[PDB]
Amino acid sequence: MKTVIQDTADVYFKRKSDGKLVFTAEAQTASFSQAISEEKLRGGIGNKPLYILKSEKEINLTVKNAFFDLEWLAMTQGETIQEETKVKVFDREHGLIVDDTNKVTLKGKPVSDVTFYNKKGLTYKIAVSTDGTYTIPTAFAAAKDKLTAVYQIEKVGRRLAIKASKFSERYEVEYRTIAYNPDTEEVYSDIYIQFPNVSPSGEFEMSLENGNALAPEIKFEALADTDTDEMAVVIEASRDE
Amino acid sequence: MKTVIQDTADVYFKRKSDGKLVFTAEAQTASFSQAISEEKLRGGIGNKPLYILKSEKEINLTVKNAFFDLEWLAMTQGETIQEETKVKVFDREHGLIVDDTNKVTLKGKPVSDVTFYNKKGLTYKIAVSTDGTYTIPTAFAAAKDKLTAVYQIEKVGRRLAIKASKFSERYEVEYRTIAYNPDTEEVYSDIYIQFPNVSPSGEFEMSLENGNALAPEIKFEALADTDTDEMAVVIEASRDE
Amino acid sequence: MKTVIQDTADVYFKRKSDGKLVFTAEAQTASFSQAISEEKLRGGIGNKPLYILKSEKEINLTVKNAFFDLEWLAMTQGETIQEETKVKVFDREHGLIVDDTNKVTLKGKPVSDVTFYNKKGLTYKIAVSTDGTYTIPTAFAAAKDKLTAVYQIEKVGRRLAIKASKFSERYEVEYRTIAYNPDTEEVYSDIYIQFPNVSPSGEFEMSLENGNALAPEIKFEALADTDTDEMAVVIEASRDE
Amino acid sequence: MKTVIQDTADVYFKRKSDGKLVFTAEAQTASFSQAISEEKLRGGIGNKPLYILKSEKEINLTVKNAFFDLEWLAMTQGETIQEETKVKVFDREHGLIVDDTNKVTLKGKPVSDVTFYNKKGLTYKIAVSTDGTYTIPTAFAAAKDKLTAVYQIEKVGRRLAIKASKFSERYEVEYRTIAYNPDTEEVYSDIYIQFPNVSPSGEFEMSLENGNALAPEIKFEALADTDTDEMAVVIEASRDE
Amino acid sequence: MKTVIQDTADVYFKRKSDGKLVFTAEAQTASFSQAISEEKLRGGIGNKPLYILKSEKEINLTVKNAFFDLEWLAMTQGETIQEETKVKVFDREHGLIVDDTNKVTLKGKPVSDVTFYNKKGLTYKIAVSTDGTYTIPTAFAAAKDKLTAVYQIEKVGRRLAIKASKFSERYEVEYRTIAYNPDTEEVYSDIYIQFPNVSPSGEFEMSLENGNALAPEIKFEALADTDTDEMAVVIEASRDE
Amino acid sequence: MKTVIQDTADVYFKRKSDGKLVFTAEAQTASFSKEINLTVKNAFFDLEWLAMTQGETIQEETKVKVFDREHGLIVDDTNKVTLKGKPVSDVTFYNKKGLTYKIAVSTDGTYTIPTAFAAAKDKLTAVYQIEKVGRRLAIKASKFSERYEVEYRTIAYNPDTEEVYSDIYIQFPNVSPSGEFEMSLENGNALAPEIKFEALADTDTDEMAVVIEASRDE
Amino acid sequence: MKTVIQDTADVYFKRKSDGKLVFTAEAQTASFSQAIKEINLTVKNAFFDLEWLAMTQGETIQEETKVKVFDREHGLIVDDTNKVTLKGKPVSDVTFYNKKGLTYKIAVSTDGTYTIPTAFAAAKDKLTAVYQIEKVGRRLAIKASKFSERYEVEYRTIAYNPDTEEVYSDIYIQFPNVSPSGEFEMSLENGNALAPEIKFEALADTDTDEMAVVIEASRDE
Amino acid sequence: MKTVIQDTADVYFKRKSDGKLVFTAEAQTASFSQAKEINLTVKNAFFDLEWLAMTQGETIQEETKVKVFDREHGLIVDDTNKVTLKGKPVSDVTFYNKKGLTYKIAVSTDGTYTIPTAFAAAKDKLTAVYQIEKVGRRLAIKASKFSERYEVEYRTIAYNPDTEEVYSDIYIQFPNVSPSGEFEMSLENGNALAPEIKFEALADTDTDEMAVVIEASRDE
Numbered sequence A, B, C, D, E: 001m002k003t004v005i006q007d008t009a010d011v012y013f014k015r016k017s018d019g020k021l022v023f024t025a026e027a028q029t030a031s032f033s034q035a036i037s038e039e040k041l042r043g044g045i046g047n048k049p050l051y052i053l054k055s056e057k058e059i060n061l062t063v064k065n066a067f068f069d070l071e072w073l074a075m076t077q078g079e080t081i082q083e084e085t086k087v088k089v090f091d092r093e094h095g096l097i098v099d100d101t102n103k104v105t106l107k108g109k110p111v112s113d114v115t116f117y118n119k120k121g122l123t124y125k126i127a128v129s130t131d132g133t134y135t136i137p138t139a140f141a142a143a144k145d146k147l148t149a150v151y152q153i154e155k156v157g158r159r160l161a162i163k164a165s166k167f168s169e170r171y172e173v174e175y176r177t178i179a180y181n182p183d184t185e186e187v188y189s190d191i192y193i194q195f196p197n198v199s200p201s202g203e204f205e206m207s208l209e210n211g212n213a214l215a216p217e218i219k220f221e222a223l224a225d226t227d228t229d230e231m232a233v234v235i236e237a238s239r240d241e
Numbered sequence F: 001m002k003t004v005i006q007d008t009a010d011v012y013f014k015r016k017s018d019g020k021l022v023f024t025a026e027a028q029t030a031s032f033s034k035e036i037n038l039t040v041k042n043a044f045f046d047l048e049w050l051a052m053t054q055g056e057t058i059q060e061e062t063k064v065k066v067f068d069r070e071h072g073l074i075v076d077d078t079n080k081v082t083l084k085g086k087p088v089s090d091v092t093f094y095n096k097k098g099l100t101y102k103i104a105v106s107t108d109g110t111y112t113i114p115t116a117f118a119a120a121k122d123k124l125t126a127v128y129q130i131e132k133v134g135r136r137l138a139i140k141a142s143k144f145s146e147r148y149e150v151e152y153r154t155i156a157y158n159p160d161t162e163e164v165y166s167d168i169y170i171q172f173p174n175v176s177p178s179g180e181f182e183m184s185l186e187n188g189n190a191l192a193p194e195i196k197f198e199a200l201a202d203t204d205t206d207e208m209a210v211v212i213e214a215s216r217d218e
Numbered sequence G: 001m002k003t004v005i006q007d008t009a010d011v012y013f014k015r016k017s018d019g020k021l022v023f024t025a026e027a028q029t030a031s032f033s034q035a036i037k038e039i040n041l042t043v044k045n046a047f048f049d050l051e052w053l054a055m056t057q058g059e060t061i062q063e064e065t066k067v068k069v070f071d072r073e074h075g076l077i078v079d080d081t082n083k084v085t086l087k088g089k090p091v092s093d094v095t096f097y098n099k100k101g102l103t104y105k106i107a108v109s110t111d112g113t114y115t116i117p118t119a120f121a122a123a124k125d126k127l128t129a130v131y132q133i134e135k136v137g138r139r140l141a142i143k144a145s146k147f148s149e150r151y152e153v154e155y156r157t158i159a160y161n162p163d164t165e166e167v168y169s170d171i172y173i174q175f176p177n178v179s180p181s182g183e184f185e186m187s188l189e190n191g192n193a194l195a196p197e198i199k200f201e202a203l204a205d206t207d208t209d210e211m212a213v214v215i216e217a218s219r220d221e
Numbered sequence H: 001m002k003t004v005i006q007d008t009a010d011v012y013f014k015r016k017s018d019g020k021l022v023f024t025a026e027a028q029t030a031s032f033s034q035a036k037e038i039n040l041t042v043k044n045a046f047f048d049l050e051w052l053a054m055t056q057g058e059t060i061q062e063e064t065k066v067k068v069f070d071r072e073h074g075l076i077v078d079d080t081n082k083v084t085l086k087g088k089p090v091s092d093v094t095f096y097n098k099k100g101l102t103y104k105i106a107v108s109t110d111g112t113y114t115i116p117t118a119f120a121a122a123k124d125k126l127t128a129v130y131q132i133e134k135v136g137r138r139l140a141i142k143a144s145k146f147s148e149r150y151e152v153e154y155r156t157i158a159y160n161p162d163t164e165e166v167y168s169d170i171y172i173q174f175p176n177v178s179p180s181g182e183f184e185m186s187l188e189n190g191n192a193l194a195p196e197i198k199f200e201a202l203a204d205t206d207t208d209e210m211a212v213v214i215e216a217s218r219d220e
Helices: A070-076 C070-076 D070-077
Strands: A010-015 A027-040 A053-065 A085-089 A153-157 A160-162 A171-181 A186-200 A204-208 A217-222 A232-238 B010-015 B021-024 B029-042 B049-064 B085-097 B103-105 B114-117 B123-126 B133-135 B146-157 B160-162 B171-180 B187-199 B205-209 B217-222 B230-238 C010-015 C021-024 C029-041 C051-064 C082-097 C103-105 C114-117 C124-126 C133-135 C146-163 C171-180 C187-201 C203-205 C217-222 C230-238 D010-015 D021-024 D027-037 D040-043 D048-052 D056-065 D082-097 D114-117 D123-126 D146-163 D171-180 D187-201 D205-208 D217-222 D233-236 E027-040 E052-065 E082-097 E103-105 E114-117 E133-135 E146-159 E176-180 E187-194 E198-209 E217-222 E232-238 F010-015 F027-032 F037-042 F062-069 F091-094 F101-103 F125-134 F137-139 F148-157 F164-177 F180-186 F194-199 F210-215 G010-015 G029-035 G038-044 G062-077 G083-085 G094-097 G103-106 G113-115 G126-142 G151-160 G167-180 G184-188 G197-202 G212-215 H012-015 H027-034 H038-044 H061-076 H093-096 H102-105 H125-138 H150-159 H166-179 H196-201 H211-215
Touching (some): A085 E232, A153 E232, A171 B085, A232 B085, B049 C051, B230 C082, C051 C187, C051 C230, C070 C217, C187 D082, C230 D082, D056 D187, D233 E082, F010 F027, F062 G212
Antiparallel strands (some): A085 A153, A186 A217, B010 B021, B010 B171, B029 B049, B085 B146, B103 B133, B114 B123, C010 C021, C051 C217, C187 C217, C230 D146, D010 D021, D027 D056, D027 E198, D114 D123, E052 E217, E114 E146, E176 E187, E198 E217, F037 F194, F062 F125, F164 F194, F164 F210, G029 G038, G094 G103, G094 G126, G151 G167, H012 H150, H093 H102
16 A cells, blocks of 8 residues: 655664664664666677676665764774773863963963963964973063963873774664555554665765754665575565554 | 646556556656767867767666555565565663662563663663563662663564566556647647656665655666667647647 | 846757758757866976866857757657657546446547556456446446546657667757846847857756756757867847947 | 955956956956875885875966956957957847738848748748748638748857867966954955966856856966966065055 | 764864964864775686775865964965065056046056056056156047056065975874753763874865855875874763763 | 677696696686697686696795894893894894994894994894795706696576576697796785696697587586 | 785895895885796886995996086076176086077186177076086996806795785795896886886706795794 | 985987087986997977987078968859969869869969869859968988987986985986987877987997996085
């Protein structure tokens, strides 16, 4: 029976050496494409007419999200998110006290507190690299513009390194959506698409624009299962049985 | 004369194998394209183009309906839908309350490993329990907390398998549309386009978006007739004859 | 003097063999584009003379109309339009009611066999009966139910066959537009673009989607004249002379 | 000092053959782009990089105006416009009423073979008559009907020829723009960009859109000056002169 | 925990040779991309791949700011901004009136020839007259006419030079953006994306269009680090630690 | 009946003295050209291919001499540094200036580089020879008496339904290896060794090569 | 066994007479060929070094001497008195070129100023000048005969196992009694590395009569 | 110390009879081969007539009257079967129609000609070929003969692989060299010419040397 489809699909992943499913209920695009490549043999007086064919099939998958999760990053660059790692990053402060005192103070932790970037222009150009308790400026004052101290701070958190590692680990994917019977405006079927033995592709793009949701997008590529030569299965389950 | 077309086309497919005929009165897109390989002959001073070399005349067809029907996308992939088969699908349970004994109770019939998610984003990997009662570790969560569960269940439905196989089935296609008279606003002509000896080339594309119609797409490739070297005919019938 | 051009040119096509004139005063788009082959004479310190090698010139034309005419289809596939040709086209009938003796009445004039569909979806194929009344099996349909019928009828009209033979003939093409005086917005001059030796090209996309006009598009591509070594001429004729 | 740029540039062109100056104060787009590529040397067991070779460079320029003049077209071809040329163009007369004697009167001066169209789309092809009155067959149109005529006339104007063996001339370009202070909202600096030894690339597009404007494009590719090896210089002056 | 990102990032730089921490906190776009390519060896009867060889990664960075600085274009090049340089630029003076004795008064200080433009279009090349006035001929403009003058003049300001030179210096880029909790709205963690060895390459683009937001665009390519064999590190630092 | 030929040919080699069935499943080229010549170009590397062009057997479990380096050593302190290898012949320690110092180290190396030239900061790089086990082939100028028999196999496809239809066997009795050989190692590209043979007429049936088209459906 | 070769071969040299190993690093091309019996060797390195050219040619690389080279001065403006100065130290006749392409040849002047005839160029005109210059540096010479040295050569390569992707074999090729030939090609193309070429001819030894040996080893040994 | 070379030479040639420096080239290839014979081959990317007259002999003659072909394409015949030309011919006029035929006529007092009625009708198009006079340089390729010798200079720059600066300048000097007779001038479609010059290097008549290789330094 003909049905209509008017919504996206819940996406489920699974790793084919363990479990560790990564479910997703907030999704915006679940795309599944198929293409066939053809090589041809030609010859003749009238034209090159086509004689015989050679063929091969490919299946591609694409998932676009609405939230940001670091586990989606770990799929395309297969490694482990190392928890409780101490890391080294930057920080800033923009003006604390008056500029003409021959003594200024800072707060919280210094590590080579350099590039003081004072005044409306020019940096420190000195890079005092001194971490006592209160750092003393020098030379002229050029008072009442800013301080603009740039730090270097050590904190703790997760990590994920990107290296040329040649990930060799497979996945199983499932898409689930609903279909509507266009006579009573009730649901009729659950449409599932199952991909066994898929592989994560290396194509990626992450852009943080001015104002918008990030919307992470990942891509895959489906290969044939070794035992049963299948690539994707479409299933139309009914809700009366 | 110069007519106006402001509507889609009704399509008809007839299988030349046994007898079948399938039509549409609700299509959303009917398209017909032609591609020809053209190169140039280049000559003397300035590399002037003089003659054009043409070959490889191909014709492609594109049909996009407004409903989802499993019999229609089984044409572009040569197989048979196995009705009334059992399969394994994914299932998710939300809103579970844990008592003071670190005990949780599930409802349903899991068949695979059970994965639990907490409110922070951590994973638990318990196996199946006989009586549907699980003991969450104390560090994972405490009393009066909420957890969600993911598992697998079994269902009965239809099943289509996408493989790497040769279809080799042929059809005859007909498009019909209407064309108005621009200076009288009455229907003037009926335009028919006929394709004999077409084949179902595989370039399937399926995209499920966030709150949008699906409009499934099927593509075909038209091949020359072996009796009158035709690939498509165009007919315009006037209602005044 | 500088002017402002805000309009679409009227187009004129003339076949170079006989002199058939096909024009359009209803165009939406008319453009032409140029391309060239560029390379460098370079290499580093030794090849310090860097020079731009320019060779090969390409000129392409595209015209998009707003009405539909079959002469544009006949131009790109060199073939005369057959007129008053008897052909066979599909025709369907909706909403037929089964009587007591399981006999339905068809008011059409079929040529091929008749196919009957019911409301749940099946198919009954029967041969033609002279009186126009067909018996119906008891299992397929019941009394006072609804059915539909599909057959083929005979109609007359124009025809045009798309064969696997490349087109012929060359066309002279002309674009005409007008330009405006900037300071006092009056008409200043007429601008003509002429192409004396131009061949058609096969790039067709006849998409008939619901709710949208057709807007046919035709593509030409230019070759050098054998006497004047020209491809296009641009003429600016003032309206006061 | 950080600035804010919000206008286009004034563009100055100079020809390095005679000393012409072509300037534009109504520009709509002025852009320049860069591109660099490098090669690396590798060897040994494991093709580890051992050296970084010289990096090459290329610069492209694009200019888009808001007016139209034949000089911008003469620049990209290198062919001089020819004043007072006698050309043959097309013309069309509408709404011609036949008399009871099957004769029409033409108010123009037809030169080529005249073409007549009627309200059904039929064509008649009749040579030029001396007295301006023609004879129309009774099968074409009856008395008191409407016909349209297409023919050719002679006109006078200016001529530009786009040949296949003329790519010429070398130029020198300058861009000027302004830059604002982001604190006091006053104009702070004047920015000049100088390109010596440029060559006009052949990339032309004239799109006569429905409505809209023309906005011609002109494209250049930059070379290196022989005396001082420079390709483009950027000068940031200030309002302190 | 899954979060939401809706803002751009800070793009701290730091050269390795000498510490010059270059700052920007008013960015408009910060993007990071990765691509993977691979090669294979073919074999016997079936042209199946035998073993893998030559798989590579490549990471690209793109930064788009909102302000404009000349120390942001000196990063792509390898030259230096030379202060206090005397340069030659064009200048234009509109609306000069020719007096009764065919002379025009000049208010500027040319250092080259003066070009005069009339109201239809023409040229006149005269040399610098030390008196300050110029004698326009009789056939150019008679009296009470408006002319335009174009010179070359002198100015002092900063002067960059875009050459074909060696780009060597490598940088350490770092991004920072904050993420929000979907359930209750406050920041949950900070996201850092530290590239550890980057090399100036790719391209540049300065598009001066008649709206606003020049938005200078810069790109980089990230190469593998020597000591740790890393390319990019993604860090999520929670605000509760 | 007409058929299409697509793929390579598996090559089988067999000596006429006693013969070992050295075979190939992955080859890139199998050509064939009164005289008949044969060329076989592989995709892997096995030492037996170059054991046929030269008449001399492989000698397993030999004892040979080879060079080895240890680049990346810096003097710890005082005067010199010690190795970690097991050298057989003398050692050649030298670095940074393109000049050498030759010595035969008993247990450790100790000598000064003109005081301020290299004392504890300028690292030295050394090279020597060691002892190793493995295989061996010697390319002499004798023992050129051997005969071989080769066979090519490929498949043919039906031009109307596209399944396999027949097998093509090209058999060459009494072939002999010829004297051209070239192994070139370059960066980033595979080896693909090439083996050349020349056919000759058999002394019994006067035949040089036989083409066999064996149908699948019989 | 079925192994795959993917890269080049490390090259080692030895001199028969005294013993001096000049090679410890990477290479670009290593090859040896058999033709009817003759064996030839080809080695292409990645860096140019004059010690390699001292092997293919029989001549000691001459050290610091006085040599005559060429120098070119680009851009000279003719003054009012047609007297052009030079920033160099010409030794022989100085040559001048104009924009059209004519040539002038004038003997050196100790004052440093050269007069320009009116037929060539006027004042404020651009000219180019070339002259001879002496210099200091190394030197090598190519003579006619007397190639009188012999060498020992060794190539080493790593061979991979296609099933598990770990290194399996360390192949070596040893060449005793090899002599440098008279073949030498040196192409200074545009925008590419030179990759200098050294060619060798192999001959049989006396004690073992082995023209060249090929050795295959393993990693479990 | 090991270097890297990435660029071409700055080849100079000088003669011995008079010794004119007519070679200051920006070449694309400058290669030297040895087999005891030594060969040189140099490819520039430009065109100079003085590059020739070196492989050949003789000299470039100046301001000599010549005779070359010229075509006028697209002549329209009037109603009275007359065709009018524009240029000035001196040998003959040959006419071609659009059907593949040929017609001939000699020079007349005026450009007006009388086309035969069987050739073409009125309002047709023809093309014409004839000969005109021009003045310019002229090089003659005679048979055999040789009277010239030369000296050759190749200059390139080396690089330090670790510092990326110029370390040494490599000079290759060729004493007495004689021009060869090998030449290939192919004018393909949409490609540069890149003329080729080959030589033959002999031993020095005094110092008994063929080629000299010199490595200068920037640490002088």
